[PDB]
Design a protein around this ligand. Structure first.
Ligand code: HEC
Length: 81
């Protein structure tokens, strides 16, 4: 989980409670990934990147990782809650 996202990049700029570049994880999730399938929806926002949805620096096009590894990360978030 942690080492996974960190292994890739999500944790690189998305911590669990604190944030460095953009918003932290517990927040992004409780921000939109706390209702319906926002995980996949937002997953669309992830690949689409963000510019003025939060206020931090604009994140590049990074979905999660690859095919399953990425899907596993997004899930790790829904579970991160
Ligand atoms: C630093 C290079 C980052 C890495 C690595 C990842 N993200 Fe990121 N993310 C970053 C910033 C600076 C921001 C804020 C952009 C802004 O609008 O100011 C974000 C934002 C997100 C969001 C928010 C989507 C939204 O609500 O519109 C998501 C869902 C998100 N980031 C996901 C995400 C994932 C899954 C990452 C690992 C693949 C990941 N980010 C890495 C900066 C960085």
């Amino acid at each position: 989980d942690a080492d996974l996202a960190k292994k890739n990049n999500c944790i690189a700029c998305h911590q669990v409670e604190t944030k460095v570049v953009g918003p932290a994880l517990k927040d992004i999730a409780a921000k939109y990934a706390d209702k319906d399938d926002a995980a996949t929806y937002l997953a669309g926002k992830i690949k689409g990147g963000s510019s003025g949805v939060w206020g931090q620096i604009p994140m590049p096009p990074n979905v999660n990782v690859s095919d399953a590894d990425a899907k596993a990360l997004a899930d790790w978030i829904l579970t991160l809650k």
